[PDB]
Design a protein around this nucleic acid. Structure first.
Lengths: 203, 148, 200, 53, 98, 52
RNA sequence: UGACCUCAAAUCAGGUAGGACUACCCGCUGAACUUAAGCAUAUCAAUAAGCGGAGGAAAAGAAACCAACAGGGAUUGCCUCAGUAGCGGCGAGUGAAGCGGCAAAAGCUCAAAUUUGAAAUCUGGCGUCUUUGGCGUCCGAGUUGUAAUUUGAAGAAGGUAUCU
RNA sequence: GUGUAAAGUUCCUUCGACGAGUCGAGUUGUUUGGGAAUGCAGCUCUAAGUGGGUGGUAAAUUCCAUCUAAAGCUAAAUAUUG
């Protein structure tokens, strides 16, 4: 079908066609509200890959997020501590801009569940994301055996807990030796390794 | 039990055994290994020489399973022979029929050559042997068979 | 702070350790409740065994080569050799592992024999089976009925055969060959190209 | 389609395969994936593409 | 058999009777297919070349193989990827000479 | 604090030693009497009764 | 005279979110006292305070894993590894992982495929019934793709011996 | 039970679609036991198809081993000053 062509063409982001489309769409998205509803995916193939279905109850929001690092919000740059903690600039947020996009969109549409999200476009001041959300109260979702799972309350605001793809990426939730500290949760691992386990018959 | 401690015997005496001049204090001298190069040098130099400095090369990601090789000497080698059949083996062993001692299956990596063997042929299966261990095994008419 | 001839210690108690002290007062209570959970699980599905049949596998690393232990599941090839589909095998008390393979014949044969032994004692009920036949069975412990058994170490009498080269010399030569293999191969390649290039 | 299915259900009552009662359809193909696959298999004789997608 | 049977040296380890292993389908991941070869050729026609890829072609045409590789590594990041990109851009040139 | 030591380990062999010693001491009339048991009208120790 | 796309309005039909609790849980943000017998890297500590989000557990989870063996085989926890490899004004300090024994064990789902001889899919209104829903019907959603079919352990399309 | 249905099982042939501002690279900051750089994040660059990742000393050349990312669900063993 056409989704394979769509996939292969979006990988040519520096081609003349894709560059033209990115210019035009960046201008148009910049002309709208910071968060707005998208009538449809601008990348239907990318939405399909991430679990979106053209059903009632699937929603798309476009959001615009400021680029760059995280300036320390201390008044006049005074940190009141040791010189190792005097940095104000060149500091970085530990979450991605994709996660911030997801969280702000989920906060705006508080009745929906954030399914996933993807990058759509970019300039020097903003990155643009489209967030796929699912309505858990819609019967087309509740009667869908492939999407009942997100109706259960353990998925309330999963994007705020780092349970989306971007969130699990930023949490370091991966297998292997490169993720020893964060494999099962960084703070859980730290607590496990800093607990004094004492038994009845001490060894 | 607290009733056996000297805290019970210090009751009634002012300083609890800590002295009137010294006056048991919080941390005179520092905490832990503080001052090991300055005012505790006389202790570390006398009792822990070699403490400061680097020696040798680092080993990133050292897996101790690679270096597993428990040793068994020759004077302890016949303890791996079945106890109920040791005495029969010590008598009837010959070049035609000698006991087989699988040292790896008993948890040993290298056969070393301390001690003396019975002048009795044996077949020793080992991952590694020393030069003298194998010379002593061959002298009693035995053999070392390398395994992995 | 450092006084007398004593060992130097590493007591890692400089954090707020007392907020993370886990004392296992509930060891006996957890033992008892664990036993009760185990009885409930067994009584729910009797006479079907509570344990799936597990394979026997070699423990990894040069330190545990000698030992053999229970694996996670039988490979697809092993189940193929006894004519059981993995989807079907999972429903008759056999564990499957799609990840493990059989490079060598020894473990494969051990697990095929183990599967055939379990398969001979299996009796699969159906609708025609009445409760009189079902009550004629006792819930066995599969982990004990088909235990993981260590191969016996070689022992007993065998003929002594003494090679001319000692074992120590063999080990030394193997070490030397491994140590200088690369440089000897590079030297030989250079020698061959030199004496067959100018000899053109 | 409802009328055709009614006729085919009448035909299956008579014992026929319901494929003889209905002629082979000759219609317009649509759907982007379907038409792309038809083009890739050299089955489309003519493709009309919208200019405002 | 396959191992030397001893604990030291080249090809050390215990001898075992080898059993032929049926390859897993996951190991076919890098293989190309008719579907992806076809789709990628049309997308190349529609999309064209990237700005750095045109720059690479000029360097290759001007006999700068050493120059092109340094650019391709600076762009793609690694020397292994730069080698494949320069080879791909020479094949593009080789297909424009007819 | 609750992480005081409450249970104490005893070597299994020593525990069995003491159990055997106590069983043996149960057959000494002087020990049973010093122990406080009103056993003066039992003709012999150990006292063994039938299985009924 | 009507479609479509995009964007609005309504006290439109029907829903949903907010707030509370704190012991455990998932993240963000984030010190200093303190130790180093001073102190700035370090330490306290990836802790306290601050902010966002849950559940009866949470999280993790069926390998882009561990290994280097004769190989293991989702995740989690315990014992051990180990106060070790390592990190560290290589000072004070700090510090995991593989293997091994055990507790518990359970596996799977999409996207990428032309149903194309028939959008086979679904929300809603109305009616009716035996009502956590069924049936009928009519709008609507949907071809910029809703069903069936496949998930790499495979699998598909043809042929194939028949069996369970 | 509408089971000429659904599913599995043997063998042959032709195939076998597998996730992109992502992987990866540089640099900056933070963090880690991770040490010519463990993870995370920002910015710049930006892929491929037996390709890609990993193989705890930076680099090029040659192999080998092992998985299959950039999409998703899932009880139990575990925690519990409410």
């Amino acid at each position: 079908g056409a989704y394979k062509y769509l996939e292969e063409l979006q990988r040519k982001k520096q081609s003349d066609v894709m560059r033209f489309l990115y210019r035009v769409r960046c201008w148009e998205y910049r002309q709208k509200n910071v968060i707005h509803r998208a009538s449809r995916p601008s990348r239907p193939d990318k939405a399909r890959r991430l679990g979106y279905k053209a059903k009632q109850g699937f929603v798309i929001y476009r959001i615009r997020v400021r680029r760059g690092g995280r300036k320390r919000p201390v008044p006049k740059g005074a940190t009141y501590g040791k010189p190792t903690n005097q940095g104000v600039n060149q500091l970085k947020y530990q979450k991605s801009l994709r996660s911030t996009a997801e969280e702000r969109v989920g906060r705006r549409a508080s009745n929906l569940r954030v399914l996933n999200s993807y990058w759509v476009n970019q300039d020097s001041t903003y990155k643009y994301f489209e967030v796929i959300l699912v309505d858990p109260s819609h019967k087309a979702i509740r009667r869908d055996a492939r999407y009942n799972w997100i109706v259960n309350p353990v998925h309330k605001h999963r994007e705020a807990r780092g349970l989306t793809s971007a969130g699990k990426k930023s949490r370091g939730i991966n297998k292997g030796h490169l993720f020893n500290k964060t494999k099962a949760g960084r703070r859980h691992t730290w607590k496990k390794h800093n607990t004094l386990s004492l038994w009845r018959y001490r060894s | 039990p607290t009733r056996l401690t000297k805290t019970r015997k210090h009751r009634g005496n002012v300083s609890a055994g800590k002295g009137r001049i010294g006056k048991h204090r919080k941390h005179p001298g520092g905490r832990g290994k503080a001052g090991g190069q300055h005012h505790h040098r006389t202790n570390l130099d006398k009792y822990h020489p070699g403490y400061f400095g680097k020696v040798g090369m680092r080993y990133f990601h050292k897996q101790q399973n690679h270096f597993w090789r428990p040793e068994i000497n020759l004077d302890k080698l016949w303890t791996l022979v079945d106890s109920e059949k040791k005495d029969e083996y010590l008598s009837k062993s010959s070049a035609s029929a000698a006991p087989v001692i699988d040292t790896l299956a008993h948890g040993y990596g290298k056969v070393l050559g301390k001690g003396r063997l019975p002048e009795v042929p044996v077949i020793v299966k080992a991952r590694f042997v020393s030069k003298l261990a194998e010379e002593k095994i061959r002298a009693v008419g035995g053999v070392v068979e390398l395994v992995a | 702070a450092i006084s007398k001839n004593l060992p130097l210690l590493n007591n890692h108690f400089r954090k707020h350790w007392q907020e993370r002290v886990r004392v296992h007062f509930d060891q006996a209570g957890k033992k008892a409740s664990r036993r009760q959970s185990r009885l409930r699980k067994a009584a729910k599905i009797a006479p079907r065994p509570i344990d799936a049949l597990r394979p026997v596998v070699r423990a990894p690393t040069v330190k545990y080569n000698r030992k053999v232990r229970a694996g996670r599941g039988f490979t697809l090839a092993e189940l193929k050799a006894v004519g059981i589909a993995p989807k079907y095998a999972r429903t008759i008390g056999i564990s499957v592992d799609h990840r493990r393979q059989n490079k060598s014949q020894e473990t494969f044969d051990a697990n095929v024999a183990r599967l055939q032994e379990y398969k001979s004692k299996l009796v699969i009920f159906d609708k025609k089976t009445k409760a009189s036949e079902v009550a004629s069975f006792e819930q066995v412990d599969v982990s004990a009925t088909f235990p993981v058994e260590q191969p016996a170490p070689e022992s007993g009498l065998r003929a002594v055969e003494v090679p001319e080269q000692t074992a120590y010399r063999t080990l030394r030569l193997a070490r030397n060959e491994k140590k200088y293999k690369g440089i000897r191969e590079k030297r030989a390649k250079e020698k061959a190209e030199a004496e067959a290039e100018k000899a053109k | 389609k409802k009328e055709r299915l009614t006729k085919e259900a009448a035909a299956i009552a008579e014992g026929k395969t319901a494929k003889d009662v209905s002629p082979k359809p000759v219609v317009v193909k649509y759907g982007l994936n379907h038409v792309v696959s038809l083009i890739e298999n050299k089955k489309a004789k003519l493709v009309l593409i919208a200019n405002d997608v | 058999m396959a191992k030397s049977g001893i604990a030291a040296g080249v090809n050390k380890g215990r001898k075992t009777t080898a059993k032929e292993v049926a390859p897993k389908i996951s190991y076919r991941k890098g293989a190309s297919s008719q579907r992806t070869v076809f789709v990628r050729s049309i997308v190349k026609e529609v999309a064209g070349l990237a700005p750095y890829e045109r720059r690479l072609i000029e360097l290759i045409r001007n006999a700068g193989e050493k120059r092109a590789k340094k650019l391709a590594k600076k762009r793609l990041g690694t020397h292994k990827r730069a080698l494949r990109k320069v080879e791909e851009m020479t094949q593009v040139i080789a297909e424009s000479r007819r | 604090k609750t992480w005081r030591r409450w249970n104490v380990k005893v070597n299994h062999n020593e525990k069995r030693y003491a159990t055997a010693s106590a069983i043996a001491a149960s057959a000494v009339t002087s020990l049973v009497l010093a122990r406080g048991h009103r056993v003066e009208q039992v003709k012999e120790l150990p006292l063994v009764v039938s299985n009924e």
